[PDB]
Amino acid sequence: MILRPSMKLVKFRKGDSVGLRLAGGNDVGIFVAGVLEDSPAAKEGLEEGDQILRVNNVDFTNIIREEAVLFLLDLPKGEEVTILAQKKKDVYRRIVESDVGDSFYIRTHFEYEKESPYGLSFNKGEVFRVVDTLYNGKLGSWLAIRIGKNHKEVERGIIPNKNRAEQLASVQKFPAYERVVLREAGFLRPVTIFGPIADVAREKLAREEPDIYQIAKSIIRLHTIKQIIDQDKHALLDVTPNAVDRLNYAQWYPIVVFLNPDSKQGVKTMRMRLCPESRKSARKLYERSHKLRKNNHHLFTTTINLNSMNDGWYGALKEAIQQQQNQLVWVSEG
C-alpha cells in the first residue's frame, strides 16, 4: 500500500450534472467511482477513489449512498459546490474488490408481496440487513439479507426502498422500515408468565429467590415496575397480551414465558400437587391457555412444555428467564 495525502478542499460549478458516479455507503463511507470526462469536477481535485466527507458543510460521513446521490441531485444547476475530500485508496480497493457499501438493519412493520423472483416477501416483524441502496444504478429498490434463525444471514434478496415501502404501507405506530440494532437489556427485564400454573410460578420464584424476584404490585402501572427494575430485581407480572404488546411498543421488552399444559387432566394433577387451596377450575385454566396460544403466540419469546408428572418446569423456567436475560434483542435507533 501507501500513505494518505493531504485533505483536499474543492470548488467547481455544477453543469447539468456534477459528473460524479459514486461507490460506498454508511459504514465504509461515500466514495467517488468516477468523474465525468471533461467535467468542471475533474478540473479540481476529484479523481476516482477519493472519499467525499463534506458538501456545503453537510455530513457525508453518516449518510447512505442513496441519500448521497440525491443530495448530489438536489443541488441547483450552475451553482457552486464545496466538497471536502480525501483520497483513501486503501478503503476504495476494498470497495471495488468486495462491493460492500451500505450496512444497517431495518425491522419491518407491514406485509409485502414479491413481484419478481429475486424479491423477498415478508410479514411484519422480519429484520433485514440493507446492503445496497441504489440496486445496480436505480432508485426505488434496495438489496437486503434476510435475518431469521439466531440472527444469521439467511437469504439475499431485493426489497422496496424506505419511501416506496411507506406507500405500500399506507394503502394498508411503526414506520414501514424501522432502523434497529442488537442490544441486551441494560436492566433486568420484566417477566410475563402464561399457562395454568402461571400464578404458582410468580408465587414460587418471588418467594424462593426473593433476591432476584419481585411481583409488581397491580392494572399495569409501570412506575410499580420501574421502581422494581431500579432494584436489580425481575419484575414478575400477571398481565395480559395487549399489556405486553404495549411494553414491546416502548422497547421495554419483557421476557414472555409460556407454560404449555400437556393435557386437560394434566393441569389438575399438577395444580393439586402445588396448590390444593386454589379454587380455580383446571378446565377453565386449560381452556384459557389455548385461546391465548391459538390467538397470538407472537407474545411468548420462549415456551416450556410442562410435564405434568413433575415440576421440572420450575427449573427450565429459571434457566430460560436467566438465559433470555442474556439475549440480544432488536431495539430502535431511527
Curated annotation (Swiss-Prot):
Residue span(s) of domain Guanylate kinase-like: 173-310
Residue span, PDZ domain: 6-87
Tissue specificity: The alpha-containing isoform is found in most epithelial cell junctions. The short isoform is found both in endothelial cells and the highly specialized epithelial junctions of renal glomeruli and Sertoli cells of the seminiferous tubules.
Disulphide bond pairs: none
Region (Occludin (OCLN)-binding region): 177-334
Subcellular location: Cell membrane; Cell junction, Tight junction; Cell junction; Cell junction, Gap junction
Domain of life: Eukaryota
PTM notes: Phosphorylated at tyrosine redidues in response to epidermal growth factor (EGF). This response is dependent on an intact actin microfilament system. Dephosphorylated by PTPRJ.
Domain SH3: 101-169
Quaternary structure and partners: Homodimer. Forms heterodimers TJP3. Forms a heterodimer (via PDZ2 domain) with TJP2/ZO2 (via PDZ2 domain). Interacts with OCLN, CALM, claudins, CGN/cingulin, CXADR, GJA12, GJD3 and UBN1. Interacts (via ZU5 domain) with CDC42BPB and MYZAP. Interacts (via PDZ domain) with GJA1. Interacts (via PDZ domains) with ANKRD2. Interacts with POPDC1 (via the C-terminus cytoplasmic tail). Interacts with HSPA4 and KIRREL1. Interacts with DLL1. Interacts with USP53 (via the C-terminal region). Interacts (via ABR region) with F-actin.
Comment field on protein domains: The 244-aa domain between residues 633 and 876 is the primary occludin (OCLN)-binding site and is required for stable association with the tight junction. The C-terminal region (residues 1151-1372) is an actin-binding region (ABR) that interacts directly with F-actin and plays an important role in the localization of TJP1 at junctions. The ABR is also required for the localization to puncta at the free edge of cells before initiation of cell-cell contact. The ABR is also necessary for TJP1 recruitment to podosomes.
Similarity field: Belongs to the MAGUK family.
Job description of the protein: TJP1, TJP2, and TJP3 are closely related scaffolding proteins that link tight junction (TJ) transmembrane proteins such as claudins, junctional adhesion molecules, and occludin to the actin cytoskeleton. Forms a multistranded TJP1/ZO1 condensate which elongates to form a tight junction belt, the belt is anchored at the apical cell membrane via interaction with PATJ. The tight junction acts to limit movement of substances through the paracellular space and as a boundary between the compositionally distinct apical and basolateral plasma membrane domains of epithelial and endothelial cells.
Protein's UniProt name: Tight junction protein 1
Native species: Homo sapiens
Included stretch of the parent chain: 417 to 803 of 1748
